Amino acid sequence: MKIAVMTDSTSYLSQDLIDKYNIQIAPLSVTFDDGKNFTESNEIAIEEFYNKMASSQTIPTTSQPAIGEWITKYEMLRDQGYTDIIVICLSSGISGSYQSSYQAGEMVEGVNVHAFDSKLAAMIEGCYVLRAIEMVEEGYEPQQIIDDLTNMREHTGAYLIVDDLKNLQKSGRITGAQAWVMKPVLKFEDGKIIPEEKVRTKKRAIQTLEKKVLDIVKDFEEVTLFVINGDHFEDGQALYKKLQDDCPSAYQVAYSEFGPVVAAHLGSGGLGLGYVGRKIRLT
Ligand SMILES: CC[C@H](C)CCCCCCCCCCCCC(=O)O
């Protein structure tokens, strides 16, 4: 038994971790209104993406990995001698990437695929990859890893804000906000993005993100927090610095950013605060 762990590009793992653990990536893509298509990778300079998105009369659209891209990746890992593949996917609530990876796993011969619906995105999704790789090294079997990740998902969540709900509304990735067709605070709930509160200022929304999350993770035996920032540098920097001041060092507090595919749906000003009830290995 040789177990591989792979994921899609929206887990936004650093190239260092991808290189070190040889993590295969099924990439998602972005398509701009001038017909220019782009595949997600760390090669992309993210400020260049925000610039083109701001200079687009029409919001760009995104694509999940086609089912054939999952298949090709599964066959490559099988043909390298892997018998089992753990697949960490973007939330099934916002993308078909998981169901495609699931269906692709049924269709590929000679290797066992264990697709996992992270029910989130970005480096919070990435944390499931890093937990899976850690357990593989420790000798666990695929069902034990899927069981552990499922328990991890019960103590994992995220809150977030955006400058303008237009991008989420255009793509249909905000649920239950038909009345809004003030500053909204959103959260993930069973893999979908819903409104949580509405505050008067952006600064109060950022303080609200911290309070919501700290109130939750206070009861966890292990805590990892991720500040995941968009195109406004000082917003993520302000939240990250304040968390380092307000949290004990027993909390793991990390920083990351949104890639093009997620940025296309949030628009400018996206800022997330995510939590995992585990001490995830980030090295
Ligand atoms: C701290 C964690 C953060 C709060 C996470 C925020 C994630 C926001 C996701 C926006 C929606 C992306 C849909 C991509 C669909 C891709 C497709 O299938 O086309």
What domains are defined for the chain? 1-153 (3.40.50.10170), 154-283 (no CATH)
Resolution in units of Å: 1.9
Alpha helices in the chain (DSSP H): 15-21, 46-54, 67-79, 97-107, 122-137, 142-153, 166-171, 202-217, 233-246, 260-266
Give the separation between CA 4 and CA 20, rounded to whole angstroms. Answer: 14
Pick the atom of ligand 1 nearest to 124's CA: 2
Cα four-point dihedral sign 273, 44, 63, 17: negative
Q: Is the CB of residue 132 less than 8 Å from the CB of residue 146?
A: no
Radius of gyration, alpha carbons of the chain: 18
Q: Give residue 19's Cα distance to chain centre.
A: 19
> What distance in angstroms lies between residue 139's CA and the mean position of ligand 1's atoms?
32
> What distance in angstroms lies between residue 243's CA and the mean position of ligand 1's atoms?
23
In this structure, are strands 183-189 and 192-199 parallel, antiparallel, or unpaired? Answer: antiparallel
Residues 6+ apart with CB under 8 A from 93: 119, 175, 190, 191, 192, 193
Pick the atom of ligand 1 nearest to 227's CA: 1
* Ligand 1 close to Cβ of residue 186 (< 6 A): no
**Method by which the model was determined:** X-ray
What are the E-state strand segments in 156-211?
156-161, 183-189, 192-199
**Strand ordering across the sheet containing 84-89:** 24-26, 3-8, 84-89, 112-117
Which of 31, 94, 97 has the most ligand 1 atoms within 8 A of CB, as the residue to mutate? 94
* Ligand 1 close to Cβ of residue 209 (< 6 A): no
